[PDB]
């Protein structure tokens, strides 16, 4: 659970993203693949080339789940239960990777929302992505 101030900042921030959420989620993925090549290990079935329609598509789905997590900020464990089980039980994603994806997201957000990415918003978003990470790796920690 985030503080009411934090929840306020996340919602304000995601509002400015608006109809760009899928473009930003796909970019966050490209940046994660380039900066941290080990993550590619989880998508051997994907075409990872710059501009891949697979990467674009998946980025839309990633952004969709973040939007749903935002509209359900007071019950993250409940809203992402199916996703929790996919990542923790069937995919066995190492927790380290969630920090890399969270970081790539913050860099993407920071470059598209210069004035909105204030220190307080930054801290609020970091806590949020950390809460989401914590939820997705629950079948285990």
């Amino acid at each position: 659970v985030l503080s009411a101030a934090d929840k306020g900042n996340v919602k304000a921030a995601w509002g400015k993203v608006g109809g760009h959420a899928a473009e930003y989620g796909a970019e966050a993925l490209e940046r994660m693949f380039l900066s941290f090549p080990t993550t590619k290990t989880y998508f051997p079935h994907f075409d990872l080339s710059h501009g891949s329609a697979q990467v674009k598509g998946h980025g839309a789905k990633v952004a969709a789940a973040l939007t749903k997590a935002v509209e359900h900020l007071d019950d993250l464990p409940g809203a992402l239960s199916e996703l929790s089980d996919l990542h923790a039980h069937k995919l066995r994603v190492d927790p380290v990777n969630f920090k890399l994806l969270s970081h790539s997201l913050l860099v993407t957000l920071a470059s598209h929302l210069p004035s909105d990415f204030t220190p307080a918003v930054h801290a609020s978003l970091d806590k949020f992505l950390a809460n989401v990470s914590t939820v997705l790796t629950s079948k285990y920690r």
Binding site: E27, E30, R31, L34, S35, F36, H103, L106, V107, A110, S111, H112, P114, F117, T118, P119, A120, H122, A123, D126
Partner: protein, 145 residues
């Protein structure tokens, strides 16, 4: 480290970086986002709120100092373990900063560079800078073993 093409891209980009500003913003954000880090800077006076930290004079000054070390490591990109040897022992043996924090500051710097350059901070240019940041963090940490 880095290939020669990477080194050239990184070097040219750095030319536009206002280290006096970026540095202050990076350290301030590190102190706001990861609160425990303030334990090492209680001497800077007031850090109780995001704005007290960001507008704190010693924070902006020390930030400039941290960034200058970076510019200096950028001119010795092949001998990072050597350039930061003294700085490593200071932080490790005299200051007692956990190495994990070197990675956190490194990442905050990348986010700050991204907020200040927007479009120009491309996914490929960021990949290159992540390499440098990792290298610098590892050089600062070698005195823990």
């Amino acid at each position: 480290m880095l290939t020669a093409e990477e080194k050239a891209a990184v070097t040219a980009f750095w030319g536009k970086v206002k280290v006096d500003e970026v540095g202050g913003e990076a350290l301030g954000r590190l102190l706001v986002v990861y609160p425990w880090t303030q334990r090492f800077f209680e001497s800077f006076g007031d850090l109780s709120t995001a704005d007290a930290v960001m507008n704190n004079p010693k924070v902006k000054a020390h930030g400039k100092k941290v960034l200058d070390s970076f510019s200096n490591g950028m001119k010795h990109l092949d001998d990072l373990k050597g350039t930061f040897a003294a700085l490593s022992e200071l932080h490790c043996d005299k200051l007692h900063v956990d190495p994990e924090n070197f990675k956190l500051l490194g990442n905050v710097l990348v986010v700050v560079l991204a907020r200040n350059f927007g479009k120009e901070f491309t996914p490929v240019l960021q990949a290159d800078f992540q390499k440098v940041v990792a290298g610098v963090a590892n050089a600062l940490a070698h005195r823990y073993h």
